[model samples]
Target: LDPDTRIPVINLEDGTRLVGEDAPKNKDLVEWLKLHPTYTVDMPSYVPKNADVLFSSFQK
Candidate 1:
C-alpha cells in the first residue's frame, strides 16, 4: 500500500465490508488536510510549513 493510500479494507463474516480507506464517510476527522511537510528533513521555514496544519496529532 502506498503512503497516500494507507489503509486496510476487508470483508467480515457478517457480510459487511470494513474499510479503513481514509474515512467511512465524509469528515475532517479522517482525511489529509494538506501536503505532508518535510519537518523531519529539517527544511527551512519548517515551523510555518508545519503550522499550516492547525491540528495534526494522533490520540488513542
Candidate 2:
C-alpha cells in the first residue's frame, strides 16, 4: 500500500483510493479545519459528500 515506489521507501495504507470523493458538507468541514490548526495542512483535502461512505474503514 506504499504510495512511493523509489528508494527510502515509506509504507502507507490502501483503500477506495479511486472511488473516494469529497464530502457534501464541505463548508462545515472547512470551518472545522479552520478551528483545528493541527490538521491545517497546505494541501487540499476531500470533503466527503455524505456520511454513507465517510471513511474507508466503514466502507464495504
Candidate 3:
C-alpha cells in the first residue's frame, strides 16, 4: 500500500502502527517494529527530484 495516499498502516494482529515522522530511528527497533503486509514508513524529510525519504538512522 502507498502511504502517501494517507497514512501507512500495518495489518498486524497487535496494536502497532507506524506513525509518520513519529516513528523510531534505530535499525533494530525498526526491524522489530515491522510485521507483514504493509507500506512504506514515513520519513521526516524528502530529497528533491528523487522524492526519496531521508530516513533518520541511530548510531547503534
Candidate 4:
C-alpha cells in the first residue's frame, strides 16, 4: 500500500514516514523512540471492550 494515501503517517523528525502497520516491522525503531523518556504510544486496538456490541449494531 502506498504510504501517501494511508490513513496515518508517523512523522519522525528526521524526514522518515512510518505508515500503517509499519511499527511492528521496525521493532528497533519503537525501542529507539522510547529513549525519549516522555515518549508514549498512541494507537488503537482490535480487542476493545464493546467490540461485539459495536459490530452487532452494524449488522444488517
Better of 2 and 3 by lDDT: 3
lDDT for each candidate structure: 0.31, 0.33, 0.42, 0.43
lDDT of 1 by residue, 1-60 (tens): 134432332223333333355322323314422222211211122233434556655241
- Candidate 3: Cα lDDT at 16: 62
Give the winner by lDDT: 1 or 3.
Answer: 3
Which ranges of candidate 4 are over 4 A from the true structure?
A: 1-9, 25-30, 35-60
Candidate scoring better on TM-score of 1 and 4: 4
Window of ten residues with lowest summed lDDT in model 2: 1-10
lDDT of 4 at 53: 44
Query: TM-scores of the models, in the given order?
Result: 0.17, 0.24, 0.26, 0.26
Q: How well is each residue in 1-60 modelled by candidate 4, as lDDT tens digits? A: 222222323444544444466543343544545653443333433334545647557464
> What ranking of all candidate models by TM-score puts the best one first?
4, 3, 2, 1
Query: Can you list the residue pairs that collide in candidate 3?
Result: none
Query: Residue 58 of candidate 2: its Cα lDDT?
Result: 56
Candidate 3 root-mean-square deviation in Å = 9.8
Query: What stretches of model 3 exceed 4 Å from their correct place?
Result: 1-11, 33-60
**lDDT tens readout by residue for model 3, 1-60:** 223323433335554666554444344444544544344444433333332334444343
- In candidate 3, residue 38 scores what lDDT? 47
